[PDB]
Amino acid sequence: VNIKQFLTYGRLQELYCSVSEKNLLHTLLLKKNQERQAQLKFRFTFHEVSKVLKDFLDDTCKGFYQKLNLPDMDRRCEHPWRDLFLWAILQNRQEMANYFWAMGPEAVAAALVGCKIMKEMAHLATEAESARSMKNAKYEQFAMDLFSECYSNSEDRAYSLLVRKTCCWSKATVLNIATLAEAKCFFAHDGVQALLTKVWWGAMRTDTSISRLVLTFFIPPLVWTSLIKFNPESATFIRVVLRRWNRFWSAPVTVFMGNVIMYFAFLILFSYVLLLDFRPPPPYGPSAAEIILYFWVFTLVLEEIRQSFFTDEDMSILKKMKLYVEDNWNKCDMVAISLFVVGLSCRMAMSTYEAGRTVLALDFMVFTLRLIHIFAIHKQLGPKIIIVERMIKDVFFFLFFLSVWLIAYGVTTQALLHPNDPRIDWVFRRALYRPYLHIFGQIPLEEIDAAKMPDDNCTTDVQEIILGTLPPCPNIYANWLVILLLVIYLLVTNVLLLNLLIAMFSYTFQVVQENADIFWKFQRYNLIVEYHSRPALAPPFIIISHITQALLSFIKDLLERELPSGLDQKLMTWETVQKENYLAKLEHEHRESSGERLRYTSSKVQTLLRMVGGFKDQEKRM
Amino acid sequence: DMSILKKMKLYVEDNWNKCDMVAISLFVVGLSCRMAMSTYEAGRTVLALDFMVFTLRLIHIFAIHKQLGPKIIIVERMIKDVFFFLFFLSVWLIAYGVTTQALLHPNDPRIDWVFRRALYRPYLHIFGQIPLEEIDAAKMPDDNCTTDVQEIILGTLPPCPNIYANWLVILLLVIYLLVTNVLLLNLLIAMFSYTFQVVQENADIFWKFQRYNLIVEYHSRPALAPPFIIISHITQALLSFIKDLLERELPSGLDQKLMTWETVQKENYLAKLEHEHRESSGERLRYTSSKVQTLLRMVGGFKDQEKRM
Ligand SMILES: C[C@@H]1CC[C@@]2(OC1)O[C@H]1C[C@H]3[C@@H]4CC=C5C[C@@H](OCC[C@H](CO)CO[C@@H]6O[C@H](CO)[C@@H](O[C@H]7O[C@H](CO)[C@@H](O)[C@H](O)[C@H]7O)[C@H](O)[C@H]6O)CC[C@]5(C)[C@H]4CC[C@]3(C)[C@H]1[C@@H]2C
Ligand SMILES: C[C@@H]1CC[C@@]2(OC1)O[C@H]1C[C@H]3[C@@H]4CC=C5C[C@@H](OCC[C@H](CO)CO[C@@H]6O[C@H](CO)[C@@H](O[C@H]7O[C@H](CO)[C@@H](O)[C@H](O)[C@H]7O)[C@H](O)[C@H]6O)CC[C@]5(C)[C@H]4CC[C@]3(C)[C@H]1[C@@H]2C
Ligand SMILES: C[C@@H]1CC[C@@]2(OC1)O[C@H]1C[C@H]3[C@@H]4CC=C5C[C@@H](O)CC[C@]5(C)[C@H]4CC[C@]3(C)[C@H]1[C@@H]2C
Ligand SMILES: C[C@@H]1CC[C@@]2(OC1)O[C@H]1C[C@H]3[C@@H]4CC=C5C[C@@H](O)CC[C@]5(C)[C@H]4CC[C@]3(C)[C@H]1[C@@H]2C
Ligand SMILES: *[C@@H]1O[C@H](CO)[C@@H](O)[C@H](O)[C@H]1NC(C)=O
Ligand SMILES: *[C@@H]1O[C@H](CO)[C@@H](O)[C@H](O)[C@H]1NC(C)=O
């Protein structure tokens, strides 16, 4: 049976029409069919499956069947194995789909697409058994194992396989599909991380020492010295030195360190303006350093806008806005800039000058917190950031417990000790602020214990208490109860709750660390991709780069590269050969397993026993 | 026999030798400054630092101890987690301290006090030192304070803290205390626990490897501890001018006997490895399957022959 000639577009549509009518794919196709009928032979048309694929992948499945709207039914499919694998995957048939994957030309991309579809369908699954089967698709494992085989074979063709534009998946890079599938375990692979490191260092050698690198960075002229090695490949000499300068300063790592250094400078300038050069309203004028700070923040905003919006030429503005606001750190950035503009506006006035100063003071803290996000790419610190973001949950659990206990204790002691204090602010103080401070060793016995209460000049009149003329006289009716409650609260909080928090942190750290490393690698991919397109000049200078880019656009990628036809075909055949070798190795290792050897031995012993019994009967006859 | 530059590089390679060089440099600088009268206090301060350096060298001295050496290795490993926590705490502390200094003393020109209230106080909040007397308006004493910048700079009167929006300052203090004294400290504790569990076994091996070198080092060391050691040095120099249990050289017969004995032991060890591999469950299963296949085909042929007759 020749799949190339057997599988035509009409036959593929017939296969899609004859679904089991009891699985998810049939329900999705029915919903799409109803939508199409409401908008306006064969039960389901290629429009329905195209819309389902748009729900699942939304970028990869473009032009699979809409290009000719439907193609000729008598025309054979251009990518038969791709369509069969996709079809078998949409209906949770894993054995048939695995077989189709084993025969397809491009297997890493197919496996990543499969794992994406399975993790998308696991949410839509109705039966628990089907959902469990989908959650254990292990298609990402297929891609990881096959790429491990490919990387072990060549390690140079593997990078091209990673960054080539796949023909069967609408010119989508394998890394693009892995990003779409959120295959975190795939990005954690050694080969992908090695390629990302190669991109990270740019033209420089990946083994360049950090000390030598920063030493070269701080004194620019040492770039032309042989202090740092470079990967291979009068006017000519000028061209040579210019190329060396560009190759060093266009590297993502140098861009990142320039951004870090100038962000430190930005924070230092912000603090200086806030603490030493914050002048009266514009009637007396903001300081020159304040104007410089305003321009610096403006350039930071321009860079953020360009990064969020002008990197993708084709995408809905609302979709990009939703994607931008999806991130919590982008929410923090929006909060920072909103605080900056509010503080600037209030500072321009005179009746809201102090409010503007306070808002700017808060904004400094927000930016200093953004510094963590900035260092997220660091190899030693990133996993720690992930781990802390995980421990926040245990922090909240402890917060709930402590809050309940603190409400109880604080309200009880406030009632027992100051029952005649009308001031709401002081009620909240003595009820929540003081019990919170008892956690950190701040136990003011001077107003909880009668033997330690000083002979201050205190009153009991409510009118005098409210006016603040004299401090309220604390009630010492039953102060043994107050002291006992303080002892119990101190015991509970400072021992049970704190040690429980410590134990929860220990257990969570042990459970999380391994997944945190993988998540850091997956995040590092996106951050490096993000630094690839970033202009080489850190703000406030970045305005020069923005102006140059805008002027070039008005007048007129190492990753995700497109290869010639011959090289692409050679790489596809090489990947197919590696897949065949990997499957053969799996089959051989299964055949030499202890269990399979025992099964074969038992079967052959049974056959030998019956044959020997027959032979012995025949021999005994003669 | 070794290059002087090579020996110097090997010596400066060690961090503890760097500490020793720092100690002696501080000693000579302090002695020179103490000989003077205009730098007497500087020399005293440098010698005070040098005492701390020597007391720290005492750890290196006890490195050979069997109970303590692994602990020294483990601590040297935990330094990395200390630095991670230091980075996190430093970022958070810069943010909180600068924000509170801006919110609370916006009119204090003194740079020293700016750095104090921005970094020294927030650092001390970690260790239970929370001076609410100057962060909370209800707890600020009625001290005789001024707002004039000229008077503030001269130090005549303490600056009057700003209480414009002090609820924000108290809330920020509460959040900072929570974060630092709970999340960061317990995260450091958890990191230490995990690192201890991971490291202890390798730390023991590293201690043994270091112990070898330290014992070799004590083999050649003169038996007289300093300041007496000068007698040993003078005696050694005089003996050199006038004129090893480990690394011993053996007679030819004994050396040949030991080589043959080692070869015999190697042969026995390889034979034991081969025997243990041959008696393994997997190899037994493989041999059984192969012999069963051969027996099955042979029995099929024999059964066909018997059925013929
Ligand atoms: C292992 C575990 C640890 C926790 C705990 O269980 C065990 O320990 C238990 C111990 C217990 C406590 C044991 C003892 C007591 C004392 C008792 O008062 C007895 C009554 C007498 C009288 O009526 C009160 O006294 C007097 O009050 C006066 C106030 O008008 C003071 O006048 C002051 O007025 C002004 C104040 O500046 C100044 O002029 C002078 O300073 C001074 O003139 C006197 O000086 C003082 O003498 C109250 C209860 C208390 C605190 C116990 C509480 C519970 C414990 C902590 C247990 C734990 C579970
Ligand atoms: C479970 C969790 C724990 C943490 C937290 O969340 C929950 O707790 C919350 C509780 C909350 C706090 C609740 C209450 C308040 C009070 C509020 O002020 C109300 C406004 C009033 C008025 O405008 C200010 O008051 C008055 O100021 C004056 C200053 O001029 C004082 O004059 C003093 O002047 C001199 C000072 O020596 C001397 O002459 C005398 O000493 C005295 O005359 C008055 O005596 C005092 O009455 C500010 C906010 C604050 C502190 C909250 C902060 C946030 C919390 C800690 C929450 C946590 C997240
Ligand atoms: C962690 C929660 C946050 C929210 C909250 O409870 C803890 O904070 C508390 C702070 C309280 C303030 C503190 C001071 C004053 C000044 C006083 O003249 C009038 C009452 C008022 C505004 C109080 C109203 C009730 C408030 C917001 C409480 C509120 C439930
Ligand atoms: C952990 C880092 C170490 C380095 C550093 O920041 C923390 O230490 C801080 C101590 C500061 C000092 C403290 C006191 C004074 C006295 C004053 O009349 C003039 C300014 C000066 C010298 C300050 C200059 C800036 C200094 C070194 C800061 C410096 C960034
Ligand atoms: C307390 O205040 C009143 C106000 O008149 C005063 O008469 C009395 O002497 C004061 N006592 C002390 C010790 O402050
Ligand atoms: C504060 O200092 C000034 C200086 O003249 C003085 O007049 C005033 O009485 C002082 N007040 C207090 C309570 O120290």
First-residue to last-residue Cα distance in chain A: 53
Tokens 């090893």 belong to which residue? B244
Structure tokens at A429: 């103080």
Integer angstrom CA distances of residue B301 from A410, A608, B294, B295: 94, 12, 11, 10
Structure tokens at B214: 């330290």
Q: Which candidate, B102, B93, B170, B167, places its Cα nearest to that of A357?
A: B102
| Beta-carbon separation of A380 and B193 below 8 A | no
Residue nearest to atom 11 of ligand 3 (CA): A428
Residue nearest to atom 13 of ligand 3 (CA): A425
CB-ligand 4 contact for B302 (6 Å cutoff): no
Closest CA–CA distance from residue B29 to any residue of chain A (Å): 30
Bridge partners of B159, per DSSP, are B146
| Beta-carbon separation of A506 and B300 below 8 A | no
Closest CA–CA distance from residue B102 to any residue of chain A (Å): 6
Residue A462: count other Cβ atoms within 10 Å of its Cβ.
Answer: 13
| Beta-carbon separation of A498 and B182 below 8 A | yes
Structure tokens at A361: 């003071």
**CB distance A182 to A526 below 8 Å:** no
Q: Phi/psi of residue A224, each to 5°?
A: -80, -15
Q: Which of B109, B128, B285 sits opposite A594 (nearest CB)?
A: B285
Cis omega (within 30 of 0) on the bond before A435?
A: no
Structure tokens at A64: 């699979």
Structure tokens at A169: 């998946």
Atom of ligand 1 nearest to the CA of A454: 37
Quickly list DSSP for B99-150. Answer: HHHHHH-TT---HHHHHIIIIIHHHHGGGT---GGGT-GGG------B--HH
Check the annotation: does A442 bind a ligand. Answer: no
CB-ligand 1 contact for A450 (6 Å cutoff): yes
What is d(CA B183, CA B78) in angstroms, rounded to the nearest whole number?
19
Q: Phi/psi of residue B258, each to 5°?
A: -65, -40
Angle between helix A107-124 and helix A80-90 axes, rounded to 10 deg = 20
Bridge partners of A173, per DSSP, are A165
Q: Phi/psi of residue A74, each to 5°?
A: -80, 0
Detail the DSSP E strand segments found in A345-461. Answer: none
Tokens 């850091």 belong to which residue? A520
**CB distance B130 to B172 below 8 Å:** no
**How many Cα atoms are found within 13 Å in the side-chain-facing hemisphere of B195?**
18
What is d(CA A250, CA A558) in angstroms, rounded to the nearest whole number?
13
Q: Which helix (H) or strand (E) holds A227?
A: none
CA geometry: angle B133, B135, B141, nearest 5 deg: 35
Q: Which candidate, A289, A214, A254, places its Cα nearest to that of A538?
A: A254
Tokens 């025992």 belong to which residue? A598
What is d(CA B46, CA B31) in angstroms, rounded to the nearest whole number?
9
Residue nearest to atom 23 of ligand 3 (CA): A425
Contact list in B for residue A502 (CB cut-off 8 A) is 186, 189-190
Q: Which of A364, A442, A612 sits opposite B102 (nearest CB)?
A: A364
| Beta-carbon separation of B164 and A384 below 8 A | no
Tokens 């030429």 belong to which residue? A313
**CB distance B289 to B297 below 8 Å:** no
Amino acid occupying residue A494: N
What is d(CA A482, CA A147) in angstroms, rounded to the nearest whole number?
68
First-residue to last-residue Cα distance in chain B: 90
Bridge partners of A172, per DSSP, are A166
**How many Cα atoms are found within 13 Å in the side-chain-facing hemisphere of B120?**
8
Using CB atoms within 10 A of its CB, is residue A18 exposed (0-12), middle (13-18) or buried (19+)? exposed
Q: Which residue of A has its CA nearest to B192?
A: A506
Amino acid occupying residue A62: K
What is d(CA A474, CA A449) in angstroms, rounded to the nearest whole number?
10
Continuous H helices in B220-280: 229-242, 252-278
| Beta-carbon separation of B194 and A381 below 8 A | no
Integer angstrom CA distances of residue A158 from A82, A113, A164, A194, B50: 21, 19, 10, 11, 57
What is d(CA A470, CA A462) in angstroms, rounded to the nearest whole number?
10
CB pairs under 8 A, 24+ apart, for A169-174? A169/A60, A169/A82, A169/A106, A169/A109, A169/A113, A170/A59, A170/A60, A170/A61, A170/A62, A170/A63, A170/A64, A171/A562, A172/A59, A172/A60, A172/A109, A173/A559, A173/A560, A174/A108, A174/A109, A174/A112
Quickly list DSSP for A29-44. Answer: HHHHHHHHHHH---SS
Ligand nearest to the CA of A453: 1
Q: Name the 3-class secondary structure at A472.
A: strand
Q: What is the DSSP letter of B246?
A: S
What is d(CA A290, CA A292) in angstroms, rounded to the nearest whole number?
5
| Beta-carbon separation of B114 and A436 below 8 A | no
Check the annotation: does A333 bind a ligand. Answer: yes
A222 φ/ψ sector (left φ>0, alpha ψ -120 to 50, else beta)? alpha
What is d(CA A339, CA A355) in angstroms, rounded to the nearest whole number?
11
Distance of CA A105 to the CA centre of its chain: 30
Name the CA dihedral angle for A67, A69, A74, A77, rounded to a multiple of 10 degrees: 30
Q: What is the DSSP letter of A219?
A: S
Q: What is the DSSP letter of A284?
A: T
What is d(CA A403, CA A92) in angstroms, rounded to the nearest whole number?
47
Q: Name the 3-class secondary structure at A88.
A: helix
What is d(CA B138, CA A471) in angstroms, rounded to the nearest whole number?
11
Closest CA–CA distance from residue A415 to any residue of chain B (Å): 20
Q: What is the DSSP letter of A396?
A: H
What is d(CA A314, CA A58) in angstroms, rounded to the nearest whole number?
14
**CB distance A365 to A483 below 8 Å:** no
**CB distance A48 to A33 below 8 Å:** yes
What is d(CA A10, CA A13) in angstroms, rounded to the nearest whole number?
5
What is d(CA B264, CA B271) in angstroms, rounded to the nearest whole number?
10
What is d(CA A208, CA A229) in angstroms, rounded to the nearest whole number?
7
Residue nearest to atom 16 of ligand 3 (CA): A425
Bridge partners of B170, per DSSP, are none
Q: Which candidate, A34, A91, A45, places its Cα nearest to that of A71?
A: A45
Q: Name the 3-class secondary structure at A260.
A: helix
CA geometry: angle B282, B287, B290, nearest 5 deg: 125
Quickly list DSSP for B155-197. Answer: TSSPBPPP-TTHHHHHHHHHHHHHIIIIIIHHHHHHHHHHHHH
What is d(CA A311, CA A320) in angstroms, rounded to the nearest whole number?
11
Non-local (6+) Cβ contacts of B55 within 8 A are: none
CA geometry: angle B128, B132, B137, nearest 5 deg: 165
Distance of CA A427 to the CA centre of its chain: 44
Integer angstrom CA distances of residue A168 from A94, A160, A557, A614, B220: 20, 16, 21, 59, 73
Q: Which candidate, A340, A309, A341, A310, places its Cα nearest to that of A325?
A: A309
What is d(CA B189, CA B196) in angstroms, rounded to the nearest whole number?
10
> How far, in Å, from the CA of B144 to the mean position of ligand 6?
6
Ligand nearest to the CA of B118: 4
Q: What is the 3-state secondary structure (H, E, C) of A427-441?
A: HHHHHHHHHHHHHHC
**CB distance A536 to A245 below 8 Å:** no
Closest CA–CA distance from residue B14 to any residue of chain A (Å): 18
Tokens 């970690």 belong to which residue? B126
Residue B176: count other Cβ atoms within 10 Å of its Cβ.
Answer: 21
Integer angstrom CA distances of residue B14 from A362, B20, B49: 46, 10, 21
What is d(CA A288, CA A512) in angstroms, rounded to the nearest whole number?
48
What is d(CA B130, CA A156) in angstroms, rounded to the nearest whole number?
59
CA geometry: angle B140, B146, B149, nearest 5 deg: 125
Contact list in B for residue A608 (CB cut-off 8 A) is 292, 295-296, 299
Which of B259-268 are b and which e, b meaning 16 or more Cβ less than 10 Å from the residue's Cβ? eeeeeeeeee
Q: Which residue of A has its CA nearest to B296?
A: A608
What is d(CA A200, CA A307) in angstroms, rounded to the nearest whole number?
18
Bridge partners of A230, per DSSP, are A204
Integer angstrom CA distances of residue B7 from B1, B4, B15, B18: 10, 5, 15, 14
**CB distance A483 to A452 below 8 Å:** no
Ligand nearest to the CA of B169: 2
What is d(CA A407, CA B92) in angstroms, rounded to the nearest whole number?
28
* Pocket lined around ligand 2, Cβ cut-off 6 Å: A 403, 406, 423, 425-426, 428-429, 432-433, 436, 468; B 137-138, 140-142, 167, 170-171, 174
What is d(CA B104, CA A346) in angstroms, rounded to the nearest whole number?
18
Method: cryo-EM
| Beta-carbon separation of A395 and B183 below 8 A | yes
Name the CA dihedral angle for A64, A70, A75, A79, rounded to a multiple of 10 degrees: 10
Bridge partners of A166, per DSSP, are A172
Residue B234: count other Cβ atoms within 10 Å of its Cβ.
Answer: 10
Angle between helix A107-124 and helix A24-39 axes, rounded to 10 deg = 80
Q: How many residues does chain A have?
A: 622
| Beta-carbon separation of B306 and A615 below 8 A | yes
What is d(CA A499, CA B26) in angstroms, rounded to the nearest whole number?
44
Q: Name the 3-class secondary structure at B253.
A: helix
What is d(CA B298, CA A612) in angstroms, rounded to the nearest whole number?
11
**CB distance A498 to A401 below 8 Å:** no
Using CB atoms within 10 A of its CB, is residue B15 exposed (0-12), middle (13-18) or buried (19+)? exposed
Using CB atoms within 10 A of its CB, is residue B117 exposed (0-12), middle (13-18) or buried (19+)? buried
As a whole number of angstroms, the longest Cα–Cα distance in chain B is 128
Structure tokens at B6: 């090579």
Closest CA–CA distance from residue B27 to any residue of chain A (Å): 30
**CB distance A521 to A187 below 8 Å:** yes
Q: Which candidate, A330, A326, A336, places its Cα nearest to that of A368?
A: A336
Tokens 């992930």 belong to which residue? A386
Q: Phi/psi of residue B130, each to 5°?
A: -115, 95
Non-local (6+) Cβ contacts of A296 within 8 A are: A266, A269, A539, A540
Q: Which of A354, A598, A611 sits opposite B299 (nearest CB)?
A: A611
What is d(CA B176, CA B169) in angstroms, rounded to the nearest whole number?
10
What is d(CA A92, CA A23) in angstroms, rounded to the nearest whole number?
8
Q: Which residue of B has its CA nearest to A619?
A: B306
Mutate to test the interface with A, among B83, B98, B112, B127 (most CBs of A within 10 A): B98
Which of A506-525 are b and which e, b meaning 16 or more Cβ less than 10 Å from the residue's Cβ? bebbeebbeebebbbbbbbb
Amino acid occupying residue A257: M
Q: Which candidate, A22, A20, A49, A21, places its Cα nearest to that of A33?
A: A49
Tokens 């491009």 belong to which residue? A106
Bridge partners of A164, per DSSP, are A561
Q: What is the DSSP letter of A165?
A: E
Q: Which of A404, A425, A434 to probe ligand 3 with, by most ligand atoms within 8 A of CB?
A: A425
Check the annotation: does A446 bind a ligand. Answer: no
Q: Which of A381, A429, A615 sits opposite B138 (nearest CB)?
A: A429
**Alpha-carbon Rg for chain B in angstroms:** 36
Quickly list DSSP for B18-75. Answer: HHHHHHHHHHHHHHHHHHSSTTHHHHHHHHHHHHHHHHHHHHHHGGG-TTTHHHHHHH
Angle between helix A353-374 and helix B69-104 axes, rounded to 10 deg = 150
| Beta-carbon separation of A597 and B300 below 8 A | no
Which of A542-556 are b and which e, b meaning 16 or more Cβ less than 10 Å from the residue's Cβ? bbebbeeeeeeeeee
Non-local (6+) Cβ contacts of B165 within 8 A are: A354, A355, A358, B103
Sign of the CA dihedral with B238 first, then B240, B243, and B248 last = positive
Non-local (6+) Cβ contacts of A163 within 8 A are: A173, A174, A175, A195, A558, A559, A560, A561
Structure tokens at B46: 């440098």
Check the annotation: does B17 bind a ligand. Answer: yes
Q: How many CB pairs under 8 A join A and B?
A: 152
Q: Which helix (H) or strand (E) holds A172?
A: strand A172-173
What is d(CA A391, CA A378) in angstroms, rounded to the nearest whole number?
20
Name the CA dihedral angle for A7, A11, A16, A17, rounded to a multiple of 10 degrees: -170
What is d(CA A202, CA A197) in angstroms, rounded to the nearest whole number?
9
